[PDB]
């Protein structure tokens, strides 16, 4: 495995959020400096095919953002780039040229402030489902959920939450069938929502999770079956270290396997690899299928990647940064892992097939999604 | 400009007209409301004076100015809103201090009551409404929970230590931009210090002020002075716990919280210094305040590093007290976390010296920028406390010109009430210890006493290193000069420092001169055993003297007094010491252990000066005595017993041993009392011819008494 | 019987490849970290793990010439006393602190294998 450490050249800003859209990995500073990079260039740089001094961003610019909120939210697709501050939101349609697969200029980007909220109402999380085409807004004070259509920003529905249940983070269904929200009062809510935005709370799991006032990055299983629950409360002995609970979608969220974290502060960023990996044991004629999940704590620069079929983490990258990790991301094939931190320093993890095992095709993962339990259809009122 | 002046004159005229016929209260005081609303925008002292009148007329807020009179137009008291209180308090701050630093400004308590009213109307900052406030408080608690690393100190000195807080940007952001809790906490701390000088201050009063400092700090005001004040509050807490509570020192669990408070004060100071170092255009007043903060942090490091602490604030336990330990079998073991020291001690010594070196550097910088600045002896005093039992005065040429300056500042800034003895005291102690251990060249050491003869006021032959004698005689004459200086210390007012001079007198007379009789004569005035109506130790506490010295120091003096008495084996004065100590429970802590030690020394002195054979009286003599023979000999002895026929030492020792047996748990005084009885009263009558024996002893004691 | 704790295979150590001085105070660093068996170049078995620290490797790669600890302590403190009367990657002589004892303490504490593992099932203490 190749690890390349790169301190970014942004002065007095923190890189809070990252997005890997197609062959482009997009970076977002605190004060609005946004740099977008081709992932392939960094891949060749990590394998020393590209020199370090020749590496430059594809399009690096400044968002027209005011002083009212800071940016922690970037999402969207190759057509539209939805960038959200902690009080405002901008969507950038036509940001990437379709024909050349190159980034359009910011003048060619149809910039539009889609929503703005005011203090003390604070945005907690921004999610978008590609399968549903619906953008999800998570809001604090009051606790409400807003659903918005892709490329039109049409308010499809609104889900209002309890005042004591301040939302912290949300989890996207890879099949686009559900959505899972972690709240302030240790309560976990699952919603059955369709393409039209009609929602249905299907499960309410309280005193299960431990949340703190931070920004978190949690992914679901690529087969849409295993629910990771970091900082678990229920079932954990008191005054121990933190733990991550794995809950099965089809088995009513019983605890399957448990991750014993060290005694420090809990994980902040969790990312499943999109690829399903297989190690064929040639001696037994067996093939062990497994996923790889990258996890990182909320205080130190310590990151661990986890094999689902192993009793150990694969390796431990300890004290990589003096600061906390803001965001991590896999590549689309999952053979590259990106990670950003507060100290404006980039860490790219280049993998080979001998590093990871044989990755299964996405048709296999879709077929595994088809075995999962089907929900009753939403009654349209 | 002119609009505000004409408005002020008109408002004053109308207020005067209303007080002339007592009728401003018509139209619900909305005239007063409007006038208050307009005078909130007019920043001048005349508008301030009319605003004082407005606050006394409306909410009946009496603002005490010496040149001020109530314009009573018969208006009932109202309640001021928080919405009105915030720009009013901001106006009060901006008019009171303007461009002057409120820390450096004299504390006017005229505005203090109304400040408390505004604080009460504001109340605490309500949590659970801002993610910023909750997150910043959580980060603050984390940062206080962080252990102590030397790299953190390096980043403090380079200014790379930051918490990266975000300002909430709320309505009350401008109030903490005014530093409202900073000013209120400053007033609270000034009144606390005034009560501390009167010794009426209490630690429970500080928690509200600490919470106010937290609320000001979590607004991301970038005010390191708030960190300075919070560390100072923790420092004063630590001072109270260390001086006034020996039970917190002895209990390691309370010592954990003391180390926590030390760590919190240190973290506040390090954050303050790194915030100042993060400032680019640092003015001179920032240097003046941060120099003082450097002094406070160095003092706290000296406190936390040394005895009785001995680096407990650098030993770290995890918050999760139980470690899930993986066994080699694949089983998980809960394991208790241990305290782990997070910094080597040499780095701590480096940090202390670096703090004081940068303090001296900034003192030189400030004195170059302000030559009327008055220096402090405290740098030399802290360097001497570094020299305490560490160096031995190896740098004698460098020992000179720092203790020289310390003693010079101490005498030249000595007030008429009580001079600054402590640099000269520590100089005397270091000279004694290093002359006695021979670590120093005596010539320059005694030559520096010619400079310190400003404080000494004795002859120059005392400071001439007259090495034309035997070294012991030179040392003894030096002890005579030190005893002369001790008499000089008796000559000063000595507000609370008589006792340790008497301790040094005893240390001179016993350890060095061999005059145990002179030391006993000195300590008998301090410890009056042979009296009855007095206390054990006379440190002049009839009902007035404060505790703190006699808690531990009186115990230590009684320990040395037991050593003095055991040097000459006097048991009568030891028994009188025990008798006085039974009524001296409130005069010291650990009265039981000191009583046991005094019993041990009394019994050892009685066994040594008079002589005994203990393992014979109980196990051997008592089973071999015939009961009728014992009764006959004891009755003939009780009929025979005369106090004039026995020495007073023997009868008084028997009486004291039986009285202490009645006082304590029996076993400690069975041996001495039975030995005195069977050796001097029973057997000499037997050769001529436990309860029963101690009853006969009681009869003989009733014959003595 | 449960499957025993087989020993971790001897993985080749991670080695710093290229360090290029950026415009920031921290230079960009390229390190190859092997995540395979060093003898067979296979995917690691279930009982292997790679554990390492950053700044310890920084001081080891840049400054192998560590002198006597007490002599360096005396030299640094006498340097501080003589001065009385960030070079990231290079060893800062102006930095007085020596971390190597505390680095050893951290190495001992991380050398504990106790709290860092995976447990299949609920955490029930025996």
From Swiss-Prot, chain A:
Disulphide bonds in the chain: none
Main location per the UniProt record: nucleus
A GO BP entry: negative regulation of transcription by RNA polymerase III
Highest taxon of the lineage: Eukaryota
Alphabetical keyword list: Chromatin regulator, Chromosome, Nucleus, Phosphoprotein, Repeat, Repressor, Transcription, Transcription regulation, WD repeat
Gene disruption: observed consequences: Abolishes localization of RTT106 to the HTA1-HTB1 promoter.
Known function: Component of the HIR complex, which cooperates with ASF1 to promote replication-independent chromatin assembly. The HIR complex is also required for the periodic repression of three of the four histone gene loci during the cell cycle as well as for autogenous regulation of the HTA1-HTB1 locus by H2A and H2B. DNA-binding by the HIR complex may repress transcription by inhibiting nucleosome remodeling by the SWI/SNF complex. The HIR complex may also be required for transcriptional silencing of centromeric, telomeric and mating-type loci in the absence of CAF-1.
Similarity section: Belongs to the WD repeat HIR1 family.
General remark: Present with 922 molecules/cell in log phase SD medium.
Name this protein carries in UniProt: Protein HIR2
Species of origin: Saccharomyces cerevisiae (strain ATCC 204508 / S288c) (Baker's yeast)
Lineage: Eukaryota, Fungi, Dikarya, Ascomycota, Saccharomycotina
Region of the whole protein represented: 1 to 381 of 875
From Swiss-Prot, chain B:
Localization: Nucleus; Chromosome
Consequences of knocking out this gene: Abolishes localization of RTT106 to the HTA1-HTB1 promoter.
Signal peptide: none
Listed name of the protein: Histone transcription regulator 3
Role noted for this protein: HIR1, HIR2 and HIR3 are repressors of histone gene transcription. They are required for the periodic repression of three of the four histone gene loci during cell cycle as well as for autogenous regulation of the HTA1-HTB1 locus by H2A and H2B. Also has a role in nucleosome assembly.
Subunit text: Component of the HIR complex, composed of HIR1, HIR2, HIR3 and HPC2. This complex may consist of one copy of HIR1 and HIR3 and two copies of HIR2 and HPC2. The HIR complex interacts with ASF1. Interacts with RTT106.
Miscellaneous comment: Present with 922 molecules/cell in log phase SD medium.
Entry's family note: Belongs to the HIR3 family.
Gene transcribed to yield this protein: HIR3
Species annotation: Saccharomyces cerevisiae (strain ATCC 204508 / S288c) (Baker's yeast)
UniProtKB/Swiss-Prot annotation, chain C:
Location of the protein in the cell: Nucleus; Chromosome
Residues annotated with Phosphoserine modification: 12
Disruption phenotype: Abolishes localization of HIR1 and RTT106 to the HTA1-HTB1 promoter.
Protein family membership: Belongs to the HPC2 family.
Subunit organization: Component of the HIR complex, composed of HIR1, HIR2, HIR3 and HPC2. This complex may consist of one copy of HIR1 and HIR3 and two copies of HIR2 and HPC2. The HIR complex interacts with ASF1. Interacts with RTT106.
Task of the protein: Component of the HIR complex, which functions as a histone chaperone that cooperates with ASF1 to promote replication-independent chromatin assembly. The HIR complex is also required for the periodic repression of three of the four histone gene loci during cell cycle as well as for autogenous regulation of the HTA1-HTB1 locus by H2A and H2B. DNA-binding by the HIR complex may repress transcription by inhibiting nucleosome remodeling by the SWI/SNF complex. The HIR complex may also be required for transcriptional silencing of centromeric, telomeric and mating-type loci in the absence of CAF-1.
Protein name stated in the entry: Histone promoter control protein 2
Organism: Saccharomyces cerevisiae (strain ATCC 204508 / S288c) (Baker's yeast)
High-level lineage: Eukaryota, Fungi, Dikarya, Ascomycota, Saccharomycotina
Gene this chain is encoded by: HPC2
């Amino acid at each position: 495995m190749r690890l390349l450490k790169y301190p970014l050249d942004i002065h007095n800003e923190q890189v809070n959020a990252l997005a890997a859209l197609g062959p482009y990995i997009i970076l977002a500073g605190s004060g609005g400096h946004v740099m977008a990079w081709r992932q392939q260039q960094l891949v060749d740089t990590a394998f020393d095919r590209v020199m370090i001094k020749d590496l430059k961003p594809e399009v690096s610019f400044q968002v027209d953002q005011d002083t009212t909120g800071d940016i922690f939210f970037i999402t969207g697709d190759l057509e539209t780039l939805y960038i959200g501050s902690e009080h405002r939101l901008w969507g950038y349609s036509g940001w990437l040229c379709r024909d050349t697969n190159n980034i359009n200029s910011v003048e060619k980007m149809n910039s539009k402030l889609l929503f703005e909220c005011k203090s003390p109402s604070t945005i907690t999380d921004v999610k978008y489902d590609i399968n549903l085409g619906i953008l999800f807004v998570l809001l604090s004070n009051e606790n409400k959920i807003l659903l918005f259509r892709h490329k039109t920003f049409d308010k499809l529905s609104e889900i209002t939450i309890d005042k004591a249940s301040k939302p912290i983070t949300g989890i996207i269904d890879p099949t686009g069938q559900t959505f899972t929200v972690m709240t302030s009062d240790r309560s976990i809510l699952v919603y059955q929502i369709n393409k039209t935005g009609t929602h249905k709370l299907i499960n309410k799991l309280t005193q299960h999770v431990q949340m703190y006032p931070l920004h978190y990055r949690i992914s679901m299983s690529p087969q849409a079956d295993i629910l990771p629950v970091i900082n678990s409360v229920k079932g954990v002995p008191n005054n121990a270290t933190s733990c991550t609970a794995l809950l099965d979608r089809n088995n009513n969220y019983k605890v399957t396997k448990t991750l014993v974290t060290p005694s420090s502060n809990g994980c902040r960023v969790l990312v499943y690899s999109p690829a399903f990996y297989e190690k064929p044991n040639l001696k037994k004629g067996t093939s062990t299928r497994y996923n790889l999940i990258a996890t990182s704590g909320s205080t130190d620069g310590t990151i661990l990647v986890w094999n689902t079929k192993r009793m150990k983490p694969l390796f431990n990258a300890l004290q990589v940064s003096s600061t906390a990790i803001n965001d991590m991301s896999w590549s689309q094939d999952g053979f590259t892992l990106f990670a950003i931190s507060n100290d404006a320093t980039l860490y790219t993890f280049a993998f080979q097939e001998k590093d990871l095992g044989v990755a299964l095709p996405q048709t296999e993962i879709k077929s595994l999604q088809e075995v999962n339990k089907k929900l009753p259809k939403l009654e349209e009122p | 400009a002119e609009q505000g002046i004409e408005t002020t004159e008109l408002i004053w005229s109308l207020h005067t007209l209303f007080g002339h016929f007592h009728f401003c209260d018509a139209s619900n005081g909305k005239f007063l409301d409007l006038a208050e609303k307009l005078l909130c925008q007019f920043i001048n002292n005349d508008s301030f004076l009319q605003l004082k009148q407005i606050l006394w007329c409306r909410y009946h807020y009496a603002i005490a100015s010496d040149n001020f009179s109530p314009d009573l137009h018969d208006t009932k008291a109202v309640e001021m809103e928080k919405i009105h209180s915030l720009p009013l308090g901001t106006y009060l701050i901006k008019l009171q201090y303007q461009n002057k630093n409120p820390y450096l400004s004299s504390s006017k308590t005229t505005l203090k009551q109304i400040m408390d009213n505004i604080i009460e109307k504001i109340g605490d900052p309500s949590t659970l409404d801002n993610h910023i406030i909750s997150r910043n408080s959580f980060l603050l608690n984390e940062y206080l929970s962080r252990p102590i690393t030397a790299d953190l100190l390096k980043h403090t000195f380079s200014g790379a230590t930051s918490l990266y807080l975000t300002s909430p940007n709320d309505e009350l952001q401008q109030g903490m931009t005014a530093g409202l809790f900073y000013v209120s906490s400053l007033q609270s701390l000034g009144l606390y210090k005034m009560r501390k000088k009167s010794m009426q201050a209490r630690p429970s009063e500080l928690d509200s002020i600490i919470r106010m400092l937290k609320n000001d700090i979590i607004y991301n005001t970038n005010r390191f002075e708030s960190w300075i004040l919070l560390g100072k509050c923790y420092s004063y807490i630590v001072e109270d716990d260390l001086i006034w509570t020996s039970d917190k020192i002895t209990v390691p669990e309370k010592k954990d919280v003391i180390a926590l408070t030390q760590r919190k004060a240190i973290l506040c100071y390090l954050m303050a210094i790194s915030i100042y170092y993060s400032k680019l255009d640092r003015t001179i007043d920032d240097k003046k305040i941060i120099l003082e903060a450097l002094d406070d942090l160095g003092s706290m490091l000296i406190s936390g590093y040394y005895n009785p602490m001995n680096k407990l604030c650098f030993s770290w336990k995890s918050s999760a007290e139980n470690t899930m330990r993986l066994s080699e079998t694949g089983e998980v073991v809960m394991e208790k976390t241990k305290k782990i020291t997070t910094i080597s001690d040499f780095n701590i010594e480096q940090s202390i010296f670096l703090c004081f070196n940068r303090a001296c550097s900034l003192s030189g910088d400030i004195k170059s920028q302000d030559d009327v600045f008055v220096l402090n002896w405290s740098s030399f005093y802290n360097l001497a406390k570094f020299f305490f039992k560490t160096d031995g005065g190896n740098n004698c040429k460098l020992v000179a010109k720092y203790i020289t300056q310390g003693c010079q500042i101490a005498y030249e800034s000595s007030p008429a009430k009580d001079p600054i003895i402590e640099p000269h005291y520590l100089l005397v102690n270091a000279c004694y210890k290093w002359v006695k251990r021979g670590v120093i060249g005596v010539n320059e050491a005694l030559t520096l006493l010619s400079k310190d003869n400003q404080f000494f006021q004795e002859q120059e032959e005392f400071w001439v290193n007259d090495e034309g004698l035997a070294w012991d005689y030179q040392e003894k004459f030096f002890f005579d000069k030190i005893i002369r200086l001790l008499r000089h210390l008796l000559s000063v007012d000595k507000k609370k420092w008589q006792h340790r001079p008497r301790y040094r007198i005893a240390r001179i007379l016993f350890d060095d001169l061999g005059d145990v009789n002179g030391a006993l004569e000195e300590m008998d005035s301090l410890i009056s055993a042979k009296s009855i109506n007095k206390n054990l130790v006379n440190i002049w506490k009839p009902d007035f003297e404060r505790p703190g010295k006699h808690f531990i120091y009186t115990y230590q003096y009684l320990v040395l007094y037991l050593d003095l008495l055991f040097a000459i084996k006097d048991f009568n004065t030891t028994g009188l010491v025990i008798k006085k100590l039974r009524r001296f429970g409130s005069g010291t802590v650990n009265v039981n252990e000191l009583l046991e030690r005094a019993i041990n020394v009394y019994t050892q002195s009685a066994k040594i000066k008079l002589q005994l054979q203990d393992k014979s009286y109980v196990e051997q003599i008592l089973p071999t005595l015939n009961y009728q023979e014992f009764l006959k000999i004891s009755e003939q002895l009780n009929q025979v017993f005369d106090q004039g026929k026995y020495p007073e030492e023997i009868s008084s020792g028997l009486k004291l041993a039986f009285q202490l047996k009645k006082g304590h748990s029996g076993i400690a005084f069975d041996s001495v009392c039975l030995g005195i009885y069977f050796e001097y009263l029973y057997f000499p009558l037997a050769r001529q011819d436990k309860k029963e024996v101690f009853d006969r002893v009681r009869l003989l004691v009733d014959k003595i008494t | 019987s449960p499957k025993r704790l087989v020993a971790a295979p001897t993985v080749s150590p991670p080695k710093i490849l290229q360090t290029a001085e950026t415009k920031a105070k921290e230079p960009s660093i390229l390190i190859d970290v092997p995540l395979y068996q060093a003898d067979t170049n296979d995917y690691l078995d279930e009982n292997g793990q790679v554990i390492f620290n950053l700044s310890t490797l920084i001081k080891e790669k840049y400054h192998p010439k560590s002198k006597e600890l007490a002599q360096l302590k005396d030299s640094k403190r006498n340097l501080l006393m003589q001065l009385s009367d960030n070079l990231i990657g290079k060893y800062d002589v102006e930095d007085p602190f020596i971390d190597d004892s505390e680095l050893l303490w951290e190495e001992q504490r991380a050398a504990t294998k106790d709290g860092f593992f995976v447990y299949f099932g609920p955490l029930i203490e025996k």
